[PDB]
């Protein structure tokens, strides 16, 4: 009953989505498309990882097919998305992870290839957005092209949903300390539009602008126009942290904030929102599958209406597991 | 007319204070005390620096005296501060920079050594605090033991004072992304009280608690009980950034915020508070002598009463230059 | 039939030795001594690791005993090694891992505490040295205090034994690119004897002197006086690499060198010496239990008598597993 | 009498060559060509540098010309090298620094643009190679297209010339610990041919192959076929170190090696080869203009015929200053 999933692009998001699908077993990958990576280089890329270690399983190439844990995978090298034969490979859902086909018209090229539904693993300008555990019940199966937002939005959402439902966020601001990105430059390099992102990633802190805090209002319509923020990109490897400063409507002591977050992390948001009281650091969340983990000891409250909350998230694994978790919920809705 | 300055401790703060005094020429160093560093090791430490480069000048040892630019410096190796003969060396002001004598009773041990006034280069529990450009006119020359707060407080004070005088800060919260220091551990190590600070500094983000935002209320009494914050220690080398989220009383567009900060950085707070509109990163402020530099392009405003302001600071040079600038103002008040 | 092992010191070597003993199950830990770490801090230290991740198992404190996987461990806080009651705790073998008791007289303090044999996890000036897979058959059970040399020696030994037995090393020089050490300073700090090791570990390359290449001649007596080398400490986290340049007596093509190393890694030196032909990097050997892994593609030969061989080693896990493997061989010799 | 120099490409080598030319004043830059960087982005790139700090001088844009220290510079955006009007701009010598036109036929496209001579700042397959201080007297002014080798070759050459002239190098091997460059990937990325260079530069050590040691035999013909080596790329920023292991013909104690290197660094190779006896680290050579600096305390000798010598070099500044120094010697030969 598991759905057939095709992956477009074998970048970081595509490789970690394939790894999450093979680790969890909720879906099955039958096809991968990349015009710039050959088969043996795909074996090398999937087998070895600097951040998450070696793959737990067997990966090899035979008869022109990538074989992972005994499952052969069709490989395409097509550059035009409308020319990829997804229907011949048996793929029903396609993950668009290259980051260059994000509009509905550009990502709709996969549907005449034989695919049924397209999931975009990036923010989209016109496709509907879904975050697991927040608004994923609003999916209604008549939508062909949807998006899964981003890692920062997936971390911030469930958290802001719990605070708003209990205390009424009047307004808020967010700052995220983010690990390096593939788009960043090892040394000062030529970035055409974003001049700050062309500077050396190993030596710098690099303020950046983001739309993840504004995208929460699309997913939670009551918070529309009430959230904004920015980001800093520090020279770490994988794990990021979200810093939210908000004004509340109802009075809330910090012990009352800790109680409702801990209760939400047990029953409704189990596996999506985490809770800890230990003295954790950033490497304690490496390969953690939670969207966000609340740090009780790191936050601070000025008074009963003005608080600052600290959350952690693995921007690689957690987000890649949410793409798989969204796809399984779509297949149960057919 | 320059005052004679003794330095207690040849750590990072003491070496950069000596370097700032020799670079600026406002004061003169006549004596250095350290019980664990010998003379030739002092020559080696002062000559070479990983962060700020080689010393611009000549440093050598002769006749048991450290000679920097032709000026001989008396060296003491005493462990008891009451036994150091500051008066025999001619030192009138003593910088207490070891970080272990911060109370008035502990830092008052230097006065029977012959010293007149003691400046503590750290926050103090009972000594009066002074930040240059904010409340340094309140010094009245009958105070023998004063403190110079900390680098984070010196960065945050100027901006806050300008914002409160023009728009009326109702309440605010601060987050600082801080570079690694000397108390942090290269690899997971045993920190007795602060368990998070014992983890590996190269691999981690490490939330920390700080009292720099609360100490602004001691320096600006109108903002008492209206500011608080925390910090993150990322694996960079020298430059930190302050992130302030505040609620204003009077309406303020972001263009009006930029105008009053730029005007304050020219006339009254010249050399203390900086202003830039370029696409800067953290390494652009290495060896910068400003206490804080306002980043106009990095901040964001949600509405006319809720803003987030970004400022930078070299926590080594700027702060060390403020210790020299405070000492010169004290000598003019005699 | 497993021996009872006591651990003196809960530093990096002691914690990874405890982790290796609980992961492998060859020995059992019954007692840990550390005068500066309390019980709950021991739980925190053993549970979380920045390099090797979270501990796979349960660790908690009850009734003053550290309980790991249901096994209670006696905790001592004694500072004098002759006062530790090893015999009351049931410990038969004691690992001296603090790095300050390395001579036979200093490490012999544990024997009137009730212990039978002492294994020093460091190079020793007068204790006999043993490297697993090279000279560990020379142990004769009448030796009470022995040493396990070091990580670099454990990496270099197996390799040089295979090359000398097949081709006759006439002379050889060595260089190791080593990851940071706890003794290194996060920022420029005061190192009393080694002035280079006091400089900032994040920003520097730092040449260092080592006696690991000379200690191979103690373990292989035919190579006495024929090996020497030095080291570089680069800002990585865990994995080091050994670079050996040697002159051979008999002619040897590089394909003949690859054949005898691959054959030795299968039969005699299985699990101690590894072999790979893939395009590996340093993070591919994180938490690898081999003493050394031969990199076939990285080495180069100038002619048939002058070659340069490249080997990898995890200086934390591999070495800690060799301490356990040495202790199990000692218990089978009783 | 200074020659007019055009620069093709505004990458790292081109920007540091322009900076070295404006700092030294031996030549003058009149023209820069880059098809992907506009004028204001050129101002931003030249003004700010993460490694070497802010530019000491004034840089601004006016009337479509880059103005540095009052000197206007013509800017071209041509992609075909044969279409660049070097003769209209007055440029006589052209530095080819893009790294893609290295053969004589490809780099000879500049000559119908009006240029007279082409200097390639890279190794070339067929152009003659020149290293300053070693074989630069062999230039005879009838050569139109020459090359300047590479940074590693420029570091190794002067050293091996001194050792061979005094002691007779029989054979030798070299290892260089190199800082990260621009071709490396911030995180695991797709490198088509060199699979190891696509792994994450921040987390890895990354063995690499180089032809710098073999290229010494082209510059010193007596050492042809007697040198080879490889490299390691560690996550530092700028400074690299060369590790040479050689067999000598004549006996040489290490004090005799230190004497001839120190004498050569004073008279003949002043400014090219350096000498130090201090306890230096890698950041002590940041922005140092020497091609190589001999580290007396870091090397080691096994016997009188088998030594290991350690040398430092700033692979950005030193090499860029040698391109300027080579061009000035060419202009004096006309």
UniProtKB/Swiss-Prot annotation, chains A, B, C, D:
Keyword Ubl conjugation tagged: yes
Glycosylation sites: 196, 199
NAD listed as a keyword: yes
Superkingdom: Eukaryota
Residues joined by cross-link Glycyl lysine isopeptide (Lys-Gly) (interchain with G-Cter in SUMO2): 185
Record-level Gene Ontology MF annotations: aspartic-type endopeptidase inhibitor activity; disordered domain specific binding; glyceraldehyde-3-phosphate dehydrogenase (NAD+) (phosphorylating) activity; identical protein binding; microtubule binding; NAD binding; NADP binding; peptidyl-cysteine S-nitrosylase activity
S-nitrosocysteine: residues carrying this PTM: 151, 246
Post-translational modification Methionine sulfoxide, affected residues: 45
Binding annotation for D-glyceraldehyde 3-phosphate: 150-152, 181, 210-211, 233
Motif mapping: [IL]-x-C-x-x-[DE] motif: 244-249
CDD domains: GAPDH_I_C (cd18126), GAPDH_I_N (cd05214)
PTM sites of type Phosphoserine: 82, 121, 147, 150, 240, 311, 332
Consequence of substituting residue 45 to L: Drastic reduction of the extent and significant prolongation of the lag phase of free radical-induced aggregation
Pfam families reported for this sequence: Gp_dh_C (PF02800), Gp_dh_N (PF00044)
Cysteine persulfide: modified positions: 151
Regions annotated as coiled coil: none
UniProt-annotated site: Activates thiol group during catalysis, residues: 178
Positions contributing to NAD(+) binding: 12-13, 34, 79, 121, 315
Consequence of changing residue 210 to A: Does not affect glycosylation by C.rodentium protein NleB
Gene3D superfamilies, A to Z: Dihydrodipicolinate Reductase, domain 2, NAD(P)-binding Rossmann-like Domain
Modified residues (Phosphothreonine): 74, 152, 176, 181, 183, 210, 228, 236
Cell compartment(s), UniProt: Cytoplasm, Cytosol; Nucleus; Cytoplasm, Perinuclear region; Membrane
Domain notes: The [IL]-x-C-x-x-[DE] motif is a proposed target motif for cysteine S-nitrosylation mediated by the iNOS-S100A8/A9 transnitrosylase complex.
Functional description taken from the UniProt entry: Has both glyceraldehyde-3-phosphate dehydrogenase and nitrosylase activities, thereby playing a role in glycolysis and nuclear functions, respectively. Glyceraldehyde-3-phosphate dehydrogenase is a key enzyme in glycolysis that catalyzes the first step of the pathway by converting D-glyceraldehyde 3-phosphate (G3P) into 3-phospho-D-glyceroyl phosphate. Modulates the organization and assembly of the cytoskeleton. Facilitates the CHP1-dependent microtubule and membrane associations through its ability to stimulate the binding of CHP1 to microtubules.
Name of the protein: Glyceraldehyde-3-phosphate dehydrogenase
Organism, as annotated: Homo sapiens
Annotated gene: GAPDH
């Amino acid at each position: 009953g598991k759905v057939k999933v095709g992956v477009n692009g074998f970048g970081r998001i595509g490789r970690l989505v394939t790894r999450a699908a093979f680790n969890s077993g909720k879906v099955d990958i039958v096809a991968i498309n990349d015009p710039f990576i050959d088969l043996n280089y795909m074996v090398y890329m999937f087998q070895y990882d600097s951040t998450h270690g070696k793959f737990h399983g067997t990966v090899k190439a035979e008869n022109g097919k990538l074989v992972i844990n005994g499952n052969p995978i069709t490989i395409f090298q097509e550059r035009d998305p409308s020319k990829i034969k997804w229907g011949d490979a048996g793929a029903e859902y396609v993950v668009e992870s290259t980051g260059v086909f994000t509009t509905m018209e550009k990502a709709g090229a996969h549907l005449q290839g034989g695919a049924k539904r397209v999931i975009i693993s990036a923010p989209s300008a016109d496709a509907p957005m879904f975050v697991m555990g927040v608004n994923h019940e609003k999916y209604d199966n008549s939508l062909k092209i949807i998006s899964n937002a981003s890692c920062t939005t997936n971390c911030l959402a469930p958290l802001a949903k719990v605070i708003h439902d209990n205390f009424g966020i009047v307004e808020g601001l967010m700052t995220t300390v983010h690990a390096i990105t593939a788009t960043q430059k090892t040394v000062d390099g030529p970035s055409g539009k974003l001049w700050r992102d062309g500077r050396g990633a190993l030596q710098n802190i690099i303020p950046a602008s983001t739309g993840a805090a504004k995208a929460v209002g699309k997913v939670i319509p009551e918070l529309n126009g009430k959230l904004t923020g920015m980001a800093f990109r520090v020279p770490t490897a994988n794990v990021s942290v979200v810093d939210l400063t908000c004004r509340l409507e109802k009075p809330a002591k910090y012990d009352d904030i800790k109680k409702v977050v801990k209760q939400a992390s047990e029953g409704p948001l189990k596996g999506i929102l985490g809770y800890t009281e230990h003295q954790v650091v950033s490497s304690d969340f490496n390969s953690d599958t939670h969207s966000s983990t609340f740090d009780a000891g790191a936050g601070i409250a000025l008074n009963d209406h003005f608080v600052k909350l600290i959350s952690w998230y693995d921007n690689e694994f957690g987000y890649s597991n949410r793409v798989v978790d969204l796809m399984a919920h779509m297949a149960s809705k057919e």
